[PDB]
Design a protein around this ligand. Structure first.
Ligand SMILES: Clc1cc(C[NH2+]CCc2nc3ccccc3[nH]2)cc(Cl)c1-c1ccccc1
Ligand SMILES: Clc1cc(C[NH2+]CCc2nc3ccccc3[nH]2)cc(Cl)c1-c1ccccc1
Ligand SMILES: Clc1cc(C[NH2+]CCc2nc3ccccc3[nH]2)cc(Cl)c1-c1ccccc1
Length: 327
């Protein structure tokens, strides 16, 4: 059978918590009043939810209303409990209220308003300094939720809101987040295909907070190399092939051997044989202004097959890549 694995940090935080902290199924939802909110304009959407900017008429303040589709609505108690537990933490979106539509019985989560800068403009115009600055802000949110015994499990640009004028960042969409319990085998059908870690792709269920660090590494590689997404897999099997074409197959087989992971019968025919590529292969005239030896060393320490070898969020914050960032 597969070799078990534990996180190397924050391993027992949930064991020392009262059951109410992590037993989200026992949580009783105190529903607020939907009539407190006037929906003004659509901000965005997804396969799980529709997002609107609204006014809370009881205080005349702007809020964000996230209407959950049935898929997201099914695990709403987990999302609520995680949001309530992390509320007040650094760069964590603040849940303000929980409402239910009496006509469709659909629930909605109400959040603090973020004056988001257009996502395309941010991807296109962020400077070398800004990338480092915002990466450090994400690491604050990740180290906080990991220290609180939660993995986000869906880290990507679409789940980060930036108010570029106020240099304010919020990690959002906690719908796929889970409590980390050592030895627990989780569902690998988490995150988004481009950001899925090798543990998910090889069906290694005993994963941990380190999955978020792989996804962070995918975000970073896309940003600095100007390649959206960095690992462009057609499906979950091809996703591992795209990763193997960069990290190489030798370190992949060393990874599976270490954890005694069993792959699909055609593994040799699908994966083939690939050398580990030098990061400089991805450096071109249009991206050289975002690349440095520090950025490459940092990326190298996030994008590792072995989930246990990746930098933790707190180690990542000590990296020389952030020495230029004003703290
Ligand atoms: Cl039913 C409803 C009415 C309202 C109140 N008049 C908003 C007018 C536009 C607000 C809201 Cl937020 C909702 C709502 C919608 C979907 C899910 C939960 C609540
Ligand atoms: Cl972290 C980040 C976030 C962004 C901006 N995302 C917008 C996400 C979003 N989802 C929404 C859902 C409903 C409504 C509005 C929404 N806005 C861009 C960029 Cl380029 C980065 C970035 C990437 C790498 C390094 C530094 C920054
Ligand atoms: Cl047949 C099988 C499939 C599985 C299912 N995970 C597939 C992991 C995987 N992802 C890939 C991506 C690209 C390429 C190959 C991939 N392989 C598990 C197991 Cl345990 C077995 C198994 C194997 C031998 C003996 C007993 C069971």
């Amino acid at each position: 059978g597969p070799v078990p694995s534990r996180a190397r940090v924050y391993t027992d935080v949930n064991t020392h918590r009262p059951s109410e902290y992590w037993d989200y199924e026992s949580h009783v939802v105190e529903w607020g009043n939907q009539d407190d909110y006037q929906l003004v304009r659509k901000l965005g959407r997804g396969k799980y939810s529709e997002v609107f900017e609204a006014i809370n008429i009881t205080n005349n303040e702007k809020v964000v209303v996230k209407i959950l589709k049935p898929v997201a609505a099914a695990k709403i108690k987990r999302e609520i409990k995680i949001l309530e537990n992390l509320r007040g933490g650094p760069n964590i979106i603040t849940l303000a209220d929980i409402v239910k539509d009496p006509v469709s019985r659909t629930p909605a989560l109400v959040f603090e308003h973020v004056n988001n800068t257009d996502f395309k403009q941010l991807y296109q115009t962020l400077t070398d300094y800004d990338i480092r600055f915002y990466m450090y802000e994400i690491l604050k949110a990740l180290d906080y939720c990991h220290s609180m015994g939660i993995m986000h499990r869906d880290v990507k640009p679409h789940n980060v809101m930036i108010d570029h004028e106020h240099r304010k960042l919020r990690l959002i969409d906690w719908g796929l987040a889970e409590f980390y319990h050592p030895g627990q085998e989780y569902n690998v059908r988490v995150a988004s295909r481009y950001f899925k870690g090798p543990e998910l792709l090889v069906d290694y269920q005993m994963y941990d907070y380190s999955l978020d660090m792989w996804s962070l590494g995918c975000m970073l590689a896309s940003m600095i190399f100007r390649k959206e997404p960095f690992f462009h897999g057609h499906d979950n099997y091809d996703q591992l092939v795209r990763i193997a074409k960069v990290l190489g197959t030798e370190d992949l087989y060393d990874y599976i051997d270490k954890y005694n992971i069993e792959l699909d019968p055609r593994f040799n025919d699908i994966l083939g044989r690939h050398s580990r590529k030098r990061w400089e292969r991805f450096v071109h005239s249009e991206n050289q202004h975002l690349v440095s030896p520090e950025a490459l060393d940092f990326l190298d320490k996030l994008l590792r097959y072995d989930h246990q070898s990746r930098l933790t969020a707190r180690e990542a914050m000590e990296h020389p890549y952030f020495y230029t960032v004003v703290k």
